[PDB]
Amino acid sequence: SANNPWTGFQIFLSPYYANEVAAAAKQITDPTLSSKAASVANIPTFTWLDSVAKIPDLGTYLASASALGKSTGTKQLVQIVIYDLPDRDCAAKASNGEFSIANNGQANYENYIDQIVAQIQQFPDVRVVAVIEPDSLANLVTNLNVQKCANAKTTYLASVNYALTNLAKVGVYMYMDAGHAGWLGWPANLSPAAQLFTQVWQNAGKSPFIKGLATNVANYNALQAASPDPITQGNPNYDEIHYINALAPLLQQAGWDATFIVDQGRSGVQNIRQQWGDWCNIKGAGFGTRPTTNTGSQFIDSIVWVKPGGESDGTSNSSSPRYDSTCSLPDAAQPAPEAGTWFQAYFQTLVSAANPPL
Numbered sequence: 001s002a003n004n005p006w007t008g009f010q011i012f013l014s015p016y017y018a019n020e021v022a023a024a025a026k027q028i029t030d031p032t033l034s035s036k037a038a039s040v041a042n043i044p045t046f047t048w049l050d051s052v053a054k055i056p057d058l059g060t061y062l063a064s065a066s067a068l069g070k071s072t073g074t075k076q077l078v079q080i081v082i083y084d085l086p087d088r089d090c091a092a093k094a095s096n097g098e099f100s101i102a103n104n105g106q107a108n109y110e111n112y113i114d115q116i117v118a119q120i121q122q123f124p125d126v127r128v129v130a131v132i133e134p135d136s137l138a139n140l141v142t143n144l145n146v147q148k149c150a151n152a153k154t155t156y157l158a159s160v161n162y163a164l165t166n167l168a169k170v171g172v173y174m175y176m177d178a179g180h181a182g183w184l185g186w187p188a189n190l191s192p193a194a195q196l197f198t199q200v201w202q203n204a205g206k207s208p209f210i211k212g213l214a215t216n217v218a219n220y221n222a223l224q225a226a227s228p229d230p231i232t233q234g235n236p237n238y239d240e241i242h243y244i245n246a247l248a249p250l251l252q253q254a255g256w257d258a259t260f261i262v263d264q265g266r267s268g269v270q271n272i273r274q275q276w277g278d279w280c281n282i283k284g285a286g287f288g289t290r291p292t293t294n295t296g297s298q299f300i301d302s303i304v305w306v307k308p309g310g311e312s313d314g315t316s317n318s319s320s321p322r323y324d325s326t327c328s329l330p331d332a333a334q335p336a337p338e339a340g341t342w343f344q345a346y347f348q349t350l351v352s353a354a355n356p357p358l
């Protein structure tokens, strides 16, 4: 649409991912692949606020971006993921979310949002783009038969509402997570999804800062596939562009001219999954299209890298209290370390298999 949050801004590069990548490139023995790997630190990624412990880091990133913009004559943009719902990941076998509905989860989550808002408030010269709660609202479309999700529904809705309402007060541009083509892009899921996202947008006051939806976050789908991945049989929306082309008009009819961002950080290699639902450390993934507003679609503001490729999706150690057995499937790279920790072998393949090449 008229106002693309990225136009005219320089994206602040994550220092944490930069540290991980430089350390990783040092361990890659081939010199040429090593320099390819090091250049990944110059590719903008999203910073995940997956716990309250990450909020002080948000503060430093905002302050660093502010000073960088003044130093270089630019306007800076910081990319964040809001990811700390109580009873997080309600349909999963394991979750690493620190908050529970049973232990004041709503109030704890509000305080998490309040601390984030208090940081952002202090740096009005820095633009912020936030992905709102991956693996949350999409469960309320398809997974209400999961008892943990059914019992979490009112909390997910209330907490996402609190995030939208209060981050809007400090001008954050917001994209609600909306799964991917193999989750909500099934034609039969489109209208239920549109009805839910519209109701959430309405509850938060239809703020213009609620720009739309984020798709393929931490997943592996093509934006535009050469041919349908065999995992997609039965779904005519076999890539993200088909999904977005089908969902966007439904939102527009509800009065919400929604735009989209699409994760492609691990989409360089297609046809690597046995089943579409397999999401953990999928073996053979490559870095995909680098972030750009040259998206090829009226509905898509930016291709983005939301999930930082190289950080594990989960351990394959079945004795871990955080073990999700999805991470032991035949198409999951193994052995894999705990979620969020660096997975060096996986990063090296992401670099080697990058498409386009690095």
Ligand SMILES: CO[C@@H]1O[C@H](CO)[C@@H](O[C@@H]2O[C@H](CO)[C@@H](S[C@@H]3O[C@H](CO)[C@@H](O[C@@H]4O[C@H](CO)[C@@H](O)[C@H](O)[C@H]4O)[C@H](O)[C@H]3O)[C@H](O)[C@H]2O)[C@H](O)[C@H]1O
Pocket (backbone or CB within 6 Å): 048, 050, 089, 091, 092, 093, 094, 095, 096, 135, 179, 180, 183, 217, 218, 219, 277, 279, 307, 308, 311, 312, 313, 314, 339, 340, 341
């Ligand atoms: C239809 O069923 C659903 O399918 C979707 C896939 O379409 C499943 O979603 C997957 O859910 C997993 C959780 O159950 C998460 S793993 C999750 O990843 C995040 C992102 O890495 C981890 O957290 C933070 O990441 C930061 C950056 O890496 C780190 O700084 C921090 O340390 C990490 O904690 C988190 O710990 C992991 O648990 C998948 O991303 C998602 O695809 C869904 O489960 C099905 O129900």
